[model samples]
Target: HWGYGKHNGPEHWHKDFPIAKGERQSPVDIDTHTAKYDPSLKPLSVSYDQATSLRILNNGHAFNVEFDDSQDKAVLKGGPLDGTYRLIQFHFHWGSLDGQGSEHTVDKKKYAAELHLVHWNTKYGDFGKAVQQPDGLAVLGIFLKVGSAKPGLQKVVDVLDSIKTKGKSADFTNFDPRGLLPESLDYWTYPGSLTTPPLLECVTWIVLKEPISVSSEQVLKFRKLNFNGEGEPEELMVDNWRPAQPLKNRQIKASFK
Candidate 1:
């Protein structure tokens, strides 16, 4: 029942998920002037095992690249986290048009898309239990702009033809997740929730200041996937991004001055 269509989109999420209006909800606009730089913050450590990469699946909303989190083989640590958080999966949010798509923005400017790498706290046990705790989840957010093509990203794009419909999946193994990140690690950190429903407020968001590149052609491939199942009305999956939520009283911390 929930989807990007106007009738069932982000605005209507609060009806089924009241937490969508909660204080810690995510995808907030990032104002560089308001973010305070903290020199004491450590550089983030991202260790992902290409071997842990599993498959690409279409869950009707977006394409998710699932990973094997059975061990600490893939994890994110340092920089605002107390312990190692295991990498679970990653997904993207893009707009139907070229000008807009990103969930979080910089000074009111939206990127063509956004990438979210999700990780759960090892101390909290399984993801099922970790998602309930405020400090149990960590998300690495990266902006995707239409520019030069990304070699690593193209590998992912190449698989879109196989999973064009919802509920479709294909093997996506031995893929390194780092190919998706921008060269710079400078970022803005804050306490927030998942942009999508179930809208859990359990996340510590680390949105990178720099963005990776994606060709306009590559983005077109993402739009080709359908939100509806094969037998359904055949709705296209575009503009699946949630609008920016209010920052409320939350303070955003920056890793660079």
Candidate 2:
């Protein structure tokens, strides 16, 4: 039922989810030229061995994955870094083509599409409860770039045929998102909020400066993903991205050794 481009599309997602209008927003333009020098950025540690059940959701934007609470096996947990954090939802942001598709920008330089893995703290019981807490969420942002024949994305590309139809999802059993993780965990950490609705300023943004490469054709296939529901066959919701917002006065810190 949720379609993009209409009055009730992603642009208006904040209308009902008031939290969307806040100082700590995401997908901001990251500019290296104006980027202040910081030497404290650190690499995030992730352990794929702890990942539990992975469910693919037909959220009408992209095939998002909801991980089981067993994600605590990862190194990130509580107090800026730990493993008690529960994996919740994860999605992607792509462009019309492979040439330009990234969601977040560095002073306007868009890479490809950014993949976000959302997690919530368990101090407040469960993810649902933690989402409502002040400091309950943590999201890891990964940048994907297009380059020469990339066989690295073969695993993900091979499954596109299964989700070809709109609102269609197939069980992605035994799939560990950790494999898709960038080797260089060196990242920029900041106190931000959810990129989507209920944009609570509770997230600790961990973004990797290094980007992963996918084949151009693989990028094309991702763009071809159906955004509309099964009802409208020809209706294609190409652009479902949210525009960049002001950074307010928030400070973004980096941990570069």
Candidate 3:
């Protein structure tokens, strides 16, 4: 299995997933000084009406908060998107060590963690088909800074213990993600790939300029999870983030100055 362990980590992914070396690989360092302000980029419309959190599970790669994807109950549109998109799932990427977790660095500064809210363009008919097209996905990235405990995050931290092992899942409900977001919707939009396997080059990334804070104690709770399944040897699911890839010929556009 392709995991963060040295034997089968990001560096070795190109051996099998050739797209790992593709031009639009994700988690790129955003040099804000170089990113141009694009006035034409519309403000993001993130409306998660009745955003029902079904269950929380450790998908071996990361613990995901799954949502009701049966229809367009929650949607993300505008801000570099041509059509509306539906929210499918959300997850995090963090570090065992405090100083090195975030996937996309700003001016070479990495945060304690990063959260991804994954969405699929509804124009493509289905999530499976959407992932194959270049303009069929949009992800909202929020960097997690360390600070005093955020009340909204305590609920998520509380549930980590029950799903400590890979493949473990527990009922989680009525969790609205709007509470987890930073106050400002100002963002940086770019063309990138999925940070996970398949590494599909099909995402329009909108990374918020502001960060949401989580206390050190809360961040530590995530380390209790395992990369190995319940029956296998245990390995904490920390430092599971992919490093920033080369920017290639693409340019980054800022929604705000």
Candidate 4:
């Protein structure tokens, strides 16, 4: 019936975030595996003005911020990368009716939620074209733990009233996501693919092992999000994160070094 815990936890992320499941899935377990260090992929620049057409979409699972590339831009210069990238959108994966929410684990310990910052290579000039490129994307994963709920996110939660209907979305112009970023920029870097559908094998994944804390009530409210579309009855979007995939043969490198 209601989702949460065990079978309902991130183990079913692919099922919940269907679009991503069939594609290049992410949040896999980090273990000793064969991985070539590509010094080419480097960090990209993100700016407020670069973020435009910001809209909040309730994908019948959770609220995702979708933006138009024409409005925002992210560039990658030097490192394993010496190119420009465009920010596509970002979303979150959380636990269901109850249980851990984060996609990445520490010492096999799962958290409350995980946030993903999705980007596309600017070489293709846009999301549609860049998505087709071999090395055309990057994703930054952030973990959200239970802590003091920040009032800043209230502005986002306030929109829940308008798009209460599942699978619905409302225009959220001029929303600067920088406010939501955690204080620590330190992170873990590695080569990985998209966690959702199309699962394209072209992305530089930067997973921040450290977690940012939020309130249990805020998490509960996040779970209240519906998975249905506009005009549809609300279907709880809780526990929609997929379980950590086995690290077949990949090594997760941290920036801490």
Sliding window of 10 residues with minimal summed lDDT for model 1: 42-51
lDDT of 1: 0.92
Residue 88 lDDT (model 1): 86
Of the pair 1 and 2, which is ahead by lDDT? 1
Candidate 4 residue runs with Cα over 4 Å from true position: 1-25, 31-50, 71-80, 229-234
Q: What tens digits encode model 4's per-residue C-alpha lDDT throughout 114-214?
A: 88878777767777776676678877778888878856566776777777655577888877667667777655666666655445667777776567777
TM-score of each: 0.98, 0.85, 0.98, 0.79
Each candidate's clash count:
1, 15, 0, 45
Candidate 1 clashing pairs, residues 3+ apart or interchain: 95-101
Q: What would you estimate as the lDDT of candidate 4?
A: 0.65
Tens digits of per-residue lDDT for model 3, 63-104: 999998888889999989998999999999999988989999
Model 1 Cα RMSD, 1 decimal: 1.0
Per residue, candidate 2 scores C-alpha lDDT tens digits across 111-148 of: 77788888777777777777677678788888888775
Candidate 2 lands at a TM-score of 0.85
Taking every candidate in turn, the Cα RMSD to the unseen true structure, in Å, is 1.0, 2.8, 0.8, 4.6
What residue runs in model 3 are displaced by over 4 Å at the alpha carbon? none
What Cα-based lDDT does every candidate model obtain? 0.92, 0.67, 0.92, 0.65
